[PDB]
Swiss-Prot record, chain A:
Name of the gene: BMP3
Disulfide bonds: 5-72, 34-104, 38-106
Reported induction: Highly expressed in fracture tissue, particularly in osteoblasts, osteoclasts and chondroblasts.
Compartments where located: Secreted
Name listed for the protein in its UniProt record: Bone morphogenetic protein 3
Residue ranges of coiled coil: none
Glycosylation sites noted in the Swiss-Prot or TrEMBL record: 98
UniProtKB/Swiss-Prot annotation, chain B:
Family: Belongs to the TGF-beta family.
Gene name in the database record: BMP3
Assembly and binders: Homodimer; disulfide-linked. Interacts with type II receptor ACVR2B.
Disulfide bonds listed in the record: 6-73, 35-105, 39-107
Induction details: Highly expressed in fracture tissue, particularly in osteoblasts, osteoclasts and chondroblasts.
UniProt organism field: Homo sapiens
Glycosylation, residue list: 99
Compartments reported by the entry: Secreted
Descriptive protein name: Bone morphogenetic protein 3
């Protein structure tokens, strides 16, 4: 994945994840994911931590083998409201946190 | 690509080796650490995946949908780093810099 760290479309279908037995609604949801380079020098929009900035320089500046790139990870996220069955077949409505990626950062 | 599970690894950063010795007075180096390792289905609870990472890892495990990477091994807890240094104007400054040292890693 050659481009910079950004958010990418991904639709997750609960039937394809094995969860169609317990989940009533929704059938699917756009989860998105993060991918791309975190390479020296990272643009300020990639919002690197102080650590990721230093890690990126250690990688660029040669020495110290095996130092990976900072990770392209979810920064802002949002919830999903799920209607589903309990282990006991009680119908439950729950807001699950951190379900969909809204933005990505280098960390 | 480290084949072990997501964990914190040793890295000592020397400021002279990253080109910052002109302005940094103390310390001359610090233990930065870094994160690497696998975040694959099924992830142990100790890797503290988010709901999203759990889902991403299942979508990956099932062949369906090409191109989905593993959740990333990133710093969860971090610590800061007091640096004595010279300003652009040659004032001596003491500043605590946040998020300098990895204390723990998570799958995200």
């Amino acid at each position: 994945e050659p481009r910079n760290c950004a958010r990418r479309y991904l639709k997750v279908d609960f039937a394809d994840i094995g969860w169609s037995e317990w989940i009533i609604s929704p059938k699917s949801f756009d989860a998105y994911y993060c991918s791309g380079a975190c390479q020296f020098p990272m643009p300020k929009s990639l919002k690197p931590s102080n650590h990721a900035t230093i890690q990126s320089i250690v990688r660029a500046v040669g020495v110290v083998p095996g130092i990976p790139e900072p990770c392209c990870v979810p920064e802002k996220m949002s919830s999903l409201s799920i209607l589903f069955f309990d282990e006991n077949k009680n119908v439950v409505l729950k807001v699950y946190p951190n379900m969909t990626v809204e933005s990505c950062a280098c960390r």
